[PDB]
RNA sequence: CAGAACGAAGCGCACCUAAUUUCGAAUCCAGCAUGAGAAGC
């Protein structure tokens, strides 16, 4: 429209942090170093999928609250349209409005990403039954990402805000149910006009 | 067309570039150690090249592949898999030491580990198809890994030598693999028995009552007088004291199928070789009295874990320092090796380890060709040694291009088939044959039915059966032995070689002494260990004799069930 | 008489995605990945570029106020008498800028990765989907020339104005995800059209 | 060289520092090779390469080990067919290569081979194609390839039921209000030149056929929700359009009811061609 | 004259090219698959038309320079006569003297010509608007002309090589505002006799 | 002359009745028979295997598979581009096509999905897996009849 | 003929999935201009 909204988040991870790394290449290649690799950039920065995290908690909370929201995490579903999320997040013939940036460290790879073992220990032996090691960005990296709503309605700032409480409780990455993920987001928002760049 | 990037001194870069019209391909992006600017400057002259090709691990020729990955010049990135592993110490060796020695670092970490992201791996008597060229690597007798390329292209057959080994190497072959067919551009690359005598001196010092510290390259040199004092059965205990080197060692155990036929198909070393982790226990030996060897690895005495042991052996009389390799020009080796400094102890050089062949071997190199090839650049080593090789190479009737200084070979493609009945279909002139493509020597002839009709009427891996093979691998796929992940890497290491695939299942079935697992999937359902171990032991054979099968033929049988490998 | 040579340089600050165009390329890749990128047969990696510039000042000169037409609504014809039009063309009169390719310095082997991505189950969380696509590394450097034939003056200023849009929002596709974040670098020359002529 | 007899090189010397030699032989170099037609015996001291050597035997083994820097390859000719082989077999043994004497031939097929009675060998069945500057040897999957093509080319040249006379129930306006409706709807641009010169062109084929165009520039997509129409030029509201797009479809059905005469001399009005 | 300049040009595509189908016939039998044919032979090659590419080029070029060349780019211009684009291609009462080749290509159309998807893409939706079709020509594929200067003047390869720069910057055939049709030129000249076939 | 070719599929252009057709004219002792495109990957085979050797469908009625089809295009199980894919490797081959569709109605053991598109509109599991296999069914049934008769059906479904 | 640095030990591996879907149209243009003679037999 005449108007855009950016929301600049900004994570701080409370708990060790693991998403991992999806290039074939870049799996392949530290297939004898690490056996979870986390997800970097090609310049040695973090990169974290932030969409589809919002669009869950987003659809995990309105579904319990009683909305016409659809799920888009069953298998090859039709984003219906008419939701909220299919405004926001999109539909398979409307695009979303909400242009939501990767999380990408402010730091490097060297700085952040730790090398661990991990453990299965049998449970009548209590021996290391199995031993694996994996990435884990610490316990006090910043990630970076920035939301561009693209026409501003009243409920999208109250409604990125809820999933990012959402986020903020379960998780984001991987392992979450064995404590990674555990983040906190500071948002700073901004109603720009979308004729900014014209001089 | 070959271009000789540096082939002069190997200082200051080495390359050698073969441009086919459809694809640069480079071989052996080395440096030679004795400056940094004309070494990015080399490498800038270098162009985009489609792959660099590295025939051993020596920084010699594997010691600017990261430089090339940090200037995108290269795309793919070819060697043995024990070249790639014995690079993935030596590239990071080479930074830790470019770092230490405050000399601004010539790449990166990163710029390695891009270097392995691009790094594809593929093992002897495979030829790879890319780029209108058949490239075939052939064992070479040098360190572990190190091969022959040979590059099969339009303009000609270039056999690209590397270092050929000698006939004193104990842990490889000594007759190095050639090509079968016809050479005709080698590349060879010019040079520059008292091994028991080792025994006897140690045998000397040791009942004498000192120790002997033994000098000793990482790469192939500590790993072969390891197997001398190995193979004597000697009475004092001989210890192996670096960090680089014992993980050298452990990678020449790990990759056994790729040493000698003896050796392969029980440690290699026999053991008795008990190993030297921790510096503190480095520091225990260098207080320590116990007569032992130490076969460890400063290189040639100028920096590492010898540089503590090498002042308690100097203030010692009754020790010995055994130089093995070359001592070289402004390192400590020579300077303890000529007397510039005053030692105690004995200094004894054994000439008889040299991972490099003398001038008879080359010459037998260039013999036992099919053909005798067209033209021999000779390349690398001294000035003098390459003036005498090559007028003996001329008396042996060989055309010699010496790195200071032409036939139009051209495989053609004859037709041999009639051509006067064709028809049109769909705006094309086409017609069916049934015929036979034979490959010859500079032609790829077809050729029709009547040909074959005159030419044929002038006319360790177990070894189980197509059917029990299917059974075996659906069973150990049905409850969870093999894998889809199983399967696809098993293909993709068949691809890399039949060895490499054997490297594979040999790596995954070993049970680990230590813990008692093996790397293979726990089978679902009930089972005893009895049967556990009955099943695993049917995952081994199975795909052992798998790997004895043709590519095609392992490739239909494992669609079945992995349906993308 | 005068023209512009806007060169542009882009390098990749996210992973980068355009899908490839050619059904015979999307066919062969097809069988080992599910969303292969626009590779030139030189096997670089090629960007559509004026459509993304045309989209940028449409929808930020709409914003302005400016009497700009709409060319991405289904078949609409183009105006004649906007900047839009003059810059990038109308039905009648051709676009005064020559907007090139967005073709990578680099080789798809370099540049180029298979990536893996989901599809989560919001109640399971488990894998419900998975589908490989290719996609262009973060550091990949991306050159373009924009050749104005009739320059006038605020053609230089609107060509940024559209880069630092796409800056914002991105190049190519999967936009909404973190995809095509991407800076641009500018150096624009008045060159004579005879200096071709000896 | 050319064997035709008497040989050829290529100048077309029919047998360049040429310098002779006494046979008790042609020295011809090129800067492609220094060639050295021998001739017949019954030697230069320097760069050999190709050594055209007439058999017709220890004697020309003593012959070729004489010559300096040993010749890349040795064409023997004029011989029989047992004497070139038994001359061919001995050099080879020697370690050097014989050789028994347009359109580039590109094969486009697959590389797997055979060790078979010394002669490296693969069975290909396949197909050779000529182009003008070349042979290509390609597979049979090239050939279905092409079939495929012919095949979804040859089902759309015939469309049935066209150019014939059968048959309906089309709608009804009289001549006047097809001729208001097609000036309106040529004004706003939905009825085009090119709409009614290919509803003339699919009219002739039959009544069927303009009527399975006109369906088909009106079936509203269930996915997109777009119909084949040109948009309307103008400031129209979504259900004005619709209408537009509905009398655009009635006038043209009504037009297919009236002679062929009557929808040409209707449609060369708004398009004089056809 | 005695001698006839003959300048063998070999061109490369950098781009993407298309140039679109004149014969009606083929294009009303290939507008079933493909919006956008390419102009080929009937012996499956790829025709690009080169003369007036080159006369625009050098109009272009030379009204810039400060000559009195004349434009037969505007409706039914007459070409004057006493110009050099007029003397190299041609009046009404002369003909030009360069005799310009179409750019037939040295492959066929299975291993150069590719069917491309483009689309229009709404503004407020980000979604496509429109699909067709195009056929186009692959980059780094080869295309080979020969001008045939017959009564040589001097300024006459130095014309011809200036034009080449200019339908290497600009384009040469079709949708050369999107970024197709960017080539490079190779000029291998060679002045022959008018008699070299008599002797 | 003998024909060897269905004579199914004429149409009626102008008054004359016509069958588009690409094939072989073998000749033979003046048989010289107008085969198909099938005889001949049959005598492929049979000089491939010679070089290389010296070295049940469900039978659904025609409005059945045209029901079968149009309800299932409905429910976008079979889509265009399904169909498409379907016509790809029906001229591959009966095989290739009995491959293809076997493919996509495999239930996975791990995941409990097939490559089918979801059915649109609400229904059970049971109906789901019904109409899955009624697709299946539908498709393998449809690689018993010829290629023409395959494009007749499927042209008026995805043009 | 090249790399080389307050204790122990073990271990650092598996598995699944890599599909599906929409659209592939639309519009403009189709002109002009010159020349119709000159010889021979
Ligand atoms: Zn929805
Ligand atoms: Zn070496
Ligand atoms: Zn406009
Ligand atoms: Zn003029």
Redesign the interface.
């Known amino acids: 429209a005449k108007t855009m909204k950016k929301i600049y988040v900004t994570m701080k991870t409370l708990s060790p942090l693991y998403t991992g790394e999806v290039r074939r290449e870049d799996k392949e290649a530290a297939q004898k170093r690490v056996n979870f690799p986390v997800r970097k950039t090609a310049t040695n920065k973090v990169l974290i999928p932030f969409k589809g995290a919002l669009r869950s908690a987003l659809e995990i909370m309105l579904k319990a609250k009683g909305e016409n929201v659809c799920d888009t995490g069953e298998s090859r579903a039709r984003p219906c349209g008419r939701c909220v999320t299919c405004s926001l997040f999109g539909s398979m013939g409307r695009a979303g409005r909400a242009s939501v940036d990767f999380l990408i460290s402010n730091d490097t790879k060297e700085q952040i990403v730790r090398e661990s073992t991990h453990l299965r220990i049998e449970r009548q032996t209590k021996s290391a039954s199995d031993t694996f090691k994996g990435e884990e960005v610490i316990e006090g990296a910043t990630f970076t990402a920035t939301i561009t709503i693209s026409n501003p309605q009243e409920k999208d700032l109250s409604l990125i805000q809820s999933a990012l409480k959402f986020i903020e409780e379960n998780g984001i990455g991987g392992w979450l149910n064995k404590g990674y993920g555990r983040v906190s987001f500071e948002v700073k928002s901004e109603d720009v006009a979308t004729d900014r760049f014209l001089k | 067309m070959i271009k000789f990037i540096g082939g002069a001194s190997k200082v200051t870069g080495s390359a050698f570039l073969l441009e086919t019209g459809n694809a640069k391909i480079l071989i052996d992006c080395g440096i030679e150690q004795e400056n940094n600017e004309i070494i990015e400057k080399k490498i800038n002259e270098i162009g985009?090249a489609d792959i660099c090709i590295l025939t051993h691990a020596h920084l010699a020729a594997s010691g600017l592949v990261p430089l090339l990955v940090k200037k995108?010049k290269v795309?793919?990135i070819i060697s043995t898999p024990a070249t790639k592993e014995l690079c993935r110490l030596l590239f990071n060796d080479f930074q830790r030491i470019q770092e230490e020695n405050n000399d601004i670092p010539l790449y990166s970490y990163?710029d390695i580990?891009s270097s392995?992201?691009?790094?594809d791996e593929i093992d002897d008597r495979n030829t790879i198809?890319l780029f209108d060229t058949k490239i075939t690597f052939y064992n070479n007798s040098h360190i572990i890994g190190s091969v022959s390329v040979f590059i099969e292209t339009h303009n000609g057959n270039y056999l690209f030598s590397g270092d050929i080994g000698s006939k004193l190497q104990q842990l490889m072959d000594y007759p190095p693999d050639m090509p079968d067919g016809?050479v005709?551009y080698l590349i060879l690359e010019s040079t520059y028995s008292d091994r028991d005598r080792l025994l006897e001196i140690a045998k000397t010092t040791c009942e004498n009552g000192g120790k002997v510290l033994i000098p000793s390259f990482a790469i192939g040199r500590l790993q072969e007088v390891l197997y001398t004092f190995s193979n004597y059965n000697f009475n004092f205990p001989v210890y192996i004291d670096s960090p680089m080197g014992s993980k050298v060692t452990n990678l020449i155990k790990e990759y056994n199928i790729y040493l000698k036929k003896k050796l392969r198909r029980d440690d290699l070393f026999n053991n008795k070789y008990i190993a030297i982790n921790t510096s503190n226990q480095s520091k225990e030996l260098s207080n320590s009295k116990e007569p032992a060897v130490i076969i460890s690895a400063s290189g040639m005495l100028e920096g590492g874990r010898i540089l503590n042991h090498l002042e308690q052996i100097k203030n010692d009389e009754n020790s010995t320092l055994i130089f093995v390799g070359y001592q070289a020009q402004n390192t400590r080796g020579r300077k303890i090796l000529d007397g510039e400094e005053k030692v105690r102890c004995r200094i004894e050089k054994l000439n008889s380890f040299s991972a490099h062949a003398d001038q008879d071997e080359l010459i037998d190199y260039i013999?036992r060709?099919?053909?005798?090839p067209?033209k021999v650049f000779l390349v690398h080593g001294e000035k003098e040694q390459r003036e005498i090789l090559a007028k003996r190479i001329?008396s042996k009737?060989?055309?010699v291009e010496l790195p200071e200084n032409?036939?139009?070979i051209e495989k053609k493609?004859?037709?041999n088939?009639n051509?006067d009945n064709?028809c049109n279909?769909?705006?094309?002139?086409?017609?069916?044959?049934?015929?036979?493509?034979?490959?010859?020597?500079?032609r790829?002839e077809?050729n029709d039915?009547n040909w074959?009709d005159m030419?044929?009427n002038?006319?360790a891996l177990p070894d189980m059966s197509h059917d029990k093979i299917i059974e075996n691998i659906e069973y150990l796929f049905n409850i969870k032995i093999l894998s889809k992940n199983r399967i696809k890497e098993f293909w993709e290491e068949f691809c890399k070689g039949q060895k490499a695939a054997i490297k594979y299942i040999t790596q995954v079935h070993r049970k680990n002494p230590n813990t008692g697992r093996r790397n293979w999937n726990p089978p679902e359902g009930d089972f005893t260990d009895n049967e556990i171990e009955k099943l695993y032991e049917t995952a081994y054979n199975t795909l052992l004799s798998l790997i004895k099968y043709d590519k095609?033929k392992v490739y239909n049988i494992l669609i079945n069930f992995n349906?993308k490998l």
Not at chain 2, 116 to 119: D, N, P, V
Not at chain 2, 369 to 372: E, N, R
Not at chain 2, 425 to 442: C, N, Q, T, W
């Open positions: 985009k995108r795309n793919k990163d580990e392995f992201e691009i790094w198809e016809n005709d013999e060709l099919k053909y005798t067209y001329i009737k060989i055309r032409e036939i139009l493609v004859v037709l088939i051509t064709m279909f769909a705006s094309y002139r086409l017609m069916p044959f049934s015929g036979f493509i034979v490959e010859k020597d500079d790829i077809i039915k074959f030419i044929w002038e006319e095609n349906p």
